[PDB]
Ligand binder design. Structure first.
Ligand SMILES: COc1ccc2c(CP(=O)(O)O)cc(=O)oc2c1
Length: 270
Protein backbone atom coordinates (compact mmCIF):
# COMPACT_ATOMS: atom_id res chain seq x y z
CA UNK A 1 0.00 0.00 0.00
CA UNK A 2 2.99 2.29 0.60
CA UNK A 3 4.03 2.89 -3.01
CA UNK A 4 0.39 3.30 -4.13
CA UNK A 5 -0.27 6.12 -1.65
CA UNK A 6 3.05 7.68 -2.72
CA UNK A 7 1.59 8.47 -6.17
CA UNK A 8 -2.16 8.75 -5.49
CA UNK A 9 -2.23 12.56 -5.55
CA UNK A 10 -0.20 13.09 -8.77
CA UNK A 11 -2.36 10.50 -10.56
CA UNK A 12 -5.57 12.26 -9.53
CA UNK A 13 -4.21 15.57 -10.83
CA UNK A 14 -3.09 13.98 -14.11
CA UNK A 15 -6.46 12.38 -14.83
CA UNK A 16 -8.33 15.55 -13.89
CA UNK A 17 -6.23 17.55 -16.36
CA UNK A 18 -6.89 14.81 -18.92
CA UNK A 19 -10.62 14.99 -18.22
CA UNK A 20 -11.25 11.29 -17.75
CA UNK A 21 -10.08 8.21 -15.93
CA UNK A 22 -6.57 6.74 -15.91
CA UNK A 23 -5.93 3.17 -14.81
CA UNK A 24 -2.42 1.99 -13.95
CA UNK A 25 -0.85 -1.11 -12.47
CA UNK A 26 2.91 -1.43 -12.35
CA UNK A 27 4.88 -4.33 -10.89
CA UNK A 28 8.56 -4.44 -9.95
CA UNK A 29 9.33 -8.09 -10.61
CA UNK A 30 12.37 -8.00 -8.33
CA UNK A 31 10.94 -6.77 -5.03
CA UNK A 32 7.31 -7.47 -5.90
CA UNK A 33 6.42 -3.86 -5.13
CA UNK A 34 3.40 -2.54 -7.00
CA UNK A 35 1.77 0.77 -7.87
CA UNK A 36 -2.00 0.87 -8.42
CA UNK A 37 -4.36 3.61 -9.56
CA UNK A 38 -7.86 2.50 -10.61
CA UNK A 39 -6.10 -0.84 -11.21
CA UNK A 40 -9.23 -2.98 -10.76
CA UNK A 41 -11.56 -0.92 -12.96
CA UNK A 42 -12.47 -2.23 -16.41
CA UNK A 43 -11.18 -0.34 -19.43
CA UNK A 44 -11.70 -1.21 -23.11
CA UNK A 45 -8.88 -3.30 -24.54
CA UNK A 46 -9.01 -1.76 -28.03
CA UNK A 47 -6.05 -3.10 -30.01
CA UNK A 48 -4.23 -4.22 -26.85
CA UNK A 49 -5.90 -7.63 -27.13
CA UNK A 50 -3.71 -8.26 -30.21
CA UNK A 51 -0.68 -8.87 -28.01
CA UNK A 52 -2.53 -11.56 -26.07
CA UNK A 53 -3.84 -12.89 -29.40
CA UNK A 54 -0.29 -13.48 -30.63
CA UNK A 55 0.61 -15.12 -27.31
CA UNK A 56 -2.37 -17.46 -27.75
CA UNK A 57 -1.14 -18.33 -31.25
CA UNK A 58 2.33 -19.05 -29.84
CA UNK A 59 0.83 -21.23 -27.10
CA UNK A 60 -1.03 -23.27 -29.71
CA UNK A 61 2.18 -23.51 -31.76
CA UNK A 62 3.75 -25.48 -28.91
CA UNK A 63 1.29 -28.32 -29.62
CA UNK A 64 0.76 -27.75 -33.37
CA UNK A 65 4.20 -27.91 -34.96
CA UNK A 66 4.22 -25.94 -38.19
CA UNK A 67 1.28 -23.72 -37.20
CA UNK A 68 3.39 -20.58 -37.50
CA UNK A 69 4.48 -21.43 -41.07
CA UNK A 70 0.95 -22.02 -42.38
CA UNK A 71 -0.03 -19.69 -45.25
CA UNK A 72 -3.34 -17.85 -44.87
CA UNK A 73 -5.05 -16.50 -47.97
CA UNK A 74 -7.71 -13.82 -47.66
CA UNK A 75 -10.04 -11.69 -49.73
CA UNK A 76 -10.45 -8.03 -50.14
CA UNK A 77 -13.43 -8.15 -47.82
CA UNK A 78 -11.05 -9.01 -44.97
CA UNK A 79 -9.23 -5.66 -45.32
CA UNK A 80 -10.90 -3.45 -42.72
CA UNK A 81 -9.45 0.00 -41.88
CA UNK A 82 -5.89 0.01 -40.49
CA UNK A 83 -4.51 -3.12 -42.11
CA UNK A 84 -1.21 -1.60 -43.24
CA UNK A 85 0.73 -4.86 -43.62
CA UNK A 86 -1.97 -7.29 -44.74
CA UNK A 87 -3.16 -4.96 -47.51
CA UNK A 88 0.29 -5.31 -49.13
CA UNK A 89 0.00 -9.13 -49.27
CA UNK A 90 -3.67 -9.40 -50.32
CA UNK A 91 -2.64 -10.93 -53.65
CA UNK A 92 -0.17 -13.36 -52.03
CA UNK A 93 -1.31 -14.33 -48.53
CA UNK A 94 0.76 -14.27 -45.33
CA UNK A 95 1.86 -16.87 -42.82
CA UNK A 96 0.34 -17.19 -39.34
CA UNK A 97 3.63 -15.91 -37.87
CA UNK A 98 3.61 -12.93 -40.25
CA UNK A 99 0.01 -12.15 -39.33
CA UNK A 100 0.95 -12.34 -35.64
CA UNK A 101 3.91 -9.99 -36.09
CA UNK A 102 1.71 -7.58 -38.07
CA UNK A 103 -1.00 -7.70 -35.40
CA UNK A 104 1.53 -6.98 -32.62
CA UNK A 105 3.91 -4.58 -34.36
CA UNK A 106 1.55 -2.64 -36.65
CA UNK A 107 -1.79 -3.33 -34.86
CA UNK A 108 -2.99 -4.76 -38.19
CA UNK A 109 -6.77 -5.20 -37.97
CA UNK A 110 -7.28 -7.68 -40.81
CA UNK A 111 -4.44 -9.76 -39.39
CA UNK A 112 -6.01 -9.69 -35.92
CA UNK A 113 -9.38 -10.83 -37.28
CA UNK A 114 -7.78 -13.60 -39.34
CA UNK A 115 -5.93 -14.91 -36.27
CA UNK A 116 -9.06 -14.60 -34.12
CA UNK A 117 -10.81 -16.87 -36.61
CA UNK A 118 -8.05 -19.48 -36.26
CA UNK A 119 -8.46 -19.49 -32.46
CA UNK A 120 -12.24 -19.86 -32.50
CA UNK A 121 -13.15 -16.18 -32.20
CA UNK A 122 -13.30 -13.88 -29.17
CA UNK A 123 -14.37 -16.75 -26.91
CA UNK A 124 -11.31 -18.75 -27.95
CA UNK A 125 -8.97 -15.92 -26.96
CA UNK A 126 -10.89 -15.49 -23.71
CA UNK A 127 -10.48 -19.23 -23.10
CA UNK A 128 -6.71 -18.91 -23.51
CA UNK A 129 -6.61 -16.08 -20.98
CA UNK A 130 -8.66 -18.19 -18.55
CA UNK A 131 -6.13 -21.00 -19.06
CA UNK A 132 -3.31 -18.82 -17.69
CA UNK A 133 -5.37 -17.75 -14.66
CA UNK A 134 -6.86 -14.46 -15.90
CA UNK A 135 -10.51 -14.34 -14.79
CA UNK A 136 -10.94 -10.65 -15.71
CA UNK A 137 -10.10 -10.47 -19.43
CA UNK A 138 -12.99 -10.75 -21.83
CA UNK A 139 -13.05 -10.36 -25.60
CA UNK A 140 -16.53 -10.38 -27.08
CA UNK A 141 -16.36 -8.86 -30.57
CA UNK A 142 -14.07 -8.46 -33.60
CA UNK A 143 -12.32 -5.51 -35.22
CA UNK A 144 -13.62 -2.91 -35.51
CA UNK A 145 -16.84 -3.36 -33.51
CA UNK A 146 -14.84 -3.96 -30.31
CA UNK A 147 -13.72 -0.30 -30.32
CA UNK A 148 -17.12 1.07 -29.24
CA UNK A 149 -15.80 1.74 -25.70
CA UNK A 150 -19.31 2.41 -24.39
CA UNK A 151 -19.28 3.72 -20.79
CA UNK A 152 -20.20 0.93 -18.38
CA UNK A 153 -20.01 -1.81 -21.04
CA UNK A 154 -17.89 -4.75 -19.88
CA UNK A 155 -17.55 -6.24 -23.39
CA UNK A 156 -13.98 -6.27 -24.71
CA UNK A 157 -12.43 -5.03 -21.47
CA UNK A 158 -9.98 -5.98 -18.79
CA UNK A 159 -8.40 -4.29 -15.80
CA UNK A 160 -4.89 -2.79 -15.65
CA UNK A 161 -3.96 -5.27 -12.91
CA UNK A 162 -5.15 -8.32 -14.88
CA UNK A 163 -3.40 -7.05 -18.03
CA UNK A 164 -0.13 -6.64 -16.11
CA UNK A 165 -0.48 -10.00 -14.35
CA UNK A 166 -1.14 -11.82 -17.63
CA UNK A 167 1.62 -9.94 -19.44
CA UNK A 168 4.07 -10.92 -16.69
CA UNK A 169 3.10 -14.60 -16.95
CA UNK A 170 3.51 -14.60 -20.73
CA UNK A 171 6.77 -12.61 -21.04
CA UNK A 172 8.62 -13.48 -17.81
CA UNK A 173 6.76 -16.41 -16.22
CA UNK A 174 6.01 -19.95 -17.33
CA UNK A 175 2.79 -19.51 -19.33
CA UNK A 176 4.73 -20.00 -22.58
CA UNK A 177 7.61 -22.33 -23.32
CA UNK A 178 11.00 -20.61 -23.40
CA UNK A 179 11.33 -20.22 -27.22
CA UNK A 180 7.74 -19.00 -27.60
CA UNK A 181 8.20 -16.62 -24.66
CA UNK A 182 11.23 -15.03 -26.33
CA UNK A 183 9.35 -14.71 -29.63
CA UNK A 184 6.53 -12.90 -27.82
CA UNK A 185 9.04 -10.55 -26.17
CA UNK A 186 10.73 -9.93 -29.52
CA UNK A 187 7.44 -9.05 -31.21
CA UNK A 188 6.61 -6.61 -28.40
CA UNK A 189 10.13 -5.14 -28.60
CA UNK A 190 9.64 -4.50 -32.32
CA UNK A 191 6.33 -2.68 -31.94
CA UNK A 192 6.19 0.44 -34.11
CA UNK A 193 2.98 2.05 -32.78
CA UNK A 194 3.96 3.00 -29.23
CA UNK A 195 6.79 5.52 -29.50
CA UNK A 196 4.72 8.24 -27.81
CA UNK A 197 3.30 6.14 -24.98
CA UNK A 198 5.14 4.07 -22.34
CA UNK A 199 8.32 4.18 -24.48
CA UNK A 200 8.35 7.98 -24.20
CA UNK A 201 8.90 7.45 -20.45
CA UNK A 202 11.71 4.88 -20.78
CA UNK A 203 15.43 5.79 -21.07
CA UNK A 204 17.11 4.87 -24.34
CA UNK A 205 19.43 2.34 -22.69
CA UNK A 206 16.53 0.26 -21.30
CA UNK A 207 14.89 -2.46 -23.36
CA UNK A 208 11.12 -2.22 -23.77
CA UNK A 209 8.36 -4.12 -25.53
CA UNK A 210 4.81 -2.82 -25.68
CA UNK A 211 1.40 -3.19 -27.27
CA UNK A 212 -0.87 -0.19 -27.81
CA UNK A 213 -4.62 0.19 -28.18
CA UNK A 214 -6.66 3.14 -29.51
CA UNK A 215 -10.45 2.92 -29.62
CA UNK A 216 -10.95 6.35 -31.21
CA UNK A 217 -13.88 7.38 -28.99
CA UNK A 218 -14.54 8.11 -25.32
CA UNK A 219 -10.95 9.25 -24.77
CA UNK A 220 -10.07 5.56 -24.77
CA UNK A 221 -6.50 4.42 -25.44
CA UNK A 222 -3.87 2.36 -23.70
CA UNK A 223 -0.47 0.70 -23.73
CA UNK A 224 1.10 -2.14 -21.78
CA UNK A 225 4.78 -2.90 -21.62
CA UNK A 226 7.62 -4.87 -20.15
CA UNK A 227 10.59 -2.61 -19.35
CA UNK A 228 14.09 -3.90 -18.62
CA UNK A 229 16.00 -1.17 -16.75
CA UNK A 230 19.71 -1.77 -16.55
CA UNK A 231 20.99 -3.26 -13.32
CA UNK A 232 17.62 -4.27 -11.88
CA UNK A 233 14.73 -6.65 -12.46
CA UNK A 234 12.16 -5.91 -15.18
CA UNK A 235 9.03 -3.84 -14.62
CA UNK A 236 5.64 -4.80 -16.05
CA UNK A 237 3.01 -2.10 -16.37
CA UNK A 238 -0.32 -1.28 -17.98
CA UNK A 239 -1.74 2.20 -18.61
CA UNK A 240 -5.37 2.49 -19.74
CA UNK A 241 -7.55 5.57 -20.23
CA UNK A 242 -11.17 6.42 -20.90
CA UNK A 243 -13.36 9.50 -20.69
CA UNK A 244 -17.08 10.22 -20.27
CA UNK A 245 -18.02 11.74 -23.66
CA UNK A 246 -17.91 10.00 -27.03
CA UNK A 247 -16.09 12.95 -28.63
CA UNK A 248 -13.40 13.16 -25.93
CA UNK A 249 -10.00 12.56 -27.48
CA UNK A 250 -7.38 10.23 -26.09
CA UNK A 251 -3.94 11.59 -25.21
CA UNK A 252 -0.65 9.83 -25.83
CA UNK A 253 1.12 12.39 -23.64
CA UNK A 254 -1.16 11.45 -20.74
CA UNK A 255 -0.28 7.76 -21.18
CA UNK A 256 3.43 8.66 -21.19
CA UNK A 257 3.00 10.86 -18.10
CA UNK A 258 1.15 8.09 -16.25
CA UNK A 259 3.95 5.64 -17.10
CA UNK A 260 6.48 8.16 -15.75
CA UNK A 261 4.54 8.44 -12.48
CA UNK A 262 4.32 4.65 -12.14
CA UNK A 263 8.06 4.24 -12.65
CA UNK A 264 8.77 7.07 -10.22
CA UNK A 265 6.46 5.43 -7.68
CA UNK A 266 8.39 2.18 -7.97
CA UNK A 267 11.62 4.12 -7.38
CA UNK A 268 13.00 3.29 -10.83
CA UNK A 269 15.18 6.29 -11.69
CA UNK A 270 14.04 7.23 -15.19
C1 LIG B 1 -9.03 1.86 -37.71
O1 LIG B 1 -8.50 2.93 -37.10
C2 LIG B 1 -7.36 2.74 -36.25
C3 LIG B 1 -6.71 1.58 -35.99
C4 LIG B 1 -5.58 1.60 -35.17
C5 LIG B 1 -5.14 2.81 -34.66
C6 LIG B 1 -4.03 2.87 -33.87
C7 LIG B 1 -3.19 1.66 -33.62
P1 LIG B 1 -3.44 1.12 -31.83
O2 LIG B 1 -3.06 2.23 -30.91
O3 LIG B 1 -4.92 0.74 -31.74
O4 LIG B 1 -2.79 0.06 -31.61
C8 LIG B 1 -3.66 4.12 -33.46
C9 LIG B 1 -4.42 5.20 -33.75
O5 LIG B 1 -4.13 6.25 -33.41
O6 LIG B 1 -5.48 5.10 -34.49
C10 LIG B 1 -5.83 3.94 -34.92
C11 LIG B 1 -6.90 3.89 -35.71
Amino acid sequence: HMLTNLVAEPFAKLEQDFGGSIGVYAMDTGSGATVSYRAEERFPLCSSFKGFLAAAVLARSQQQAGLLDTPIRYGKNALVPWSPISEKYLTTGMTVAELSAAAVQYSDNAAANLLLKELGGPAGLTAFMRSIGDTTFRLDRWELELNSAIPGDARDTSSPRAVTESLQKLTLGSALAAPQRQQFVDWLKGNTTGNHRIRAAVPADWAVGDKTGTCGVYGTANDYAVVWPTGRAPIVLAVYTRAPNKDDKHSEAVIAAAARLALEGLGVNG
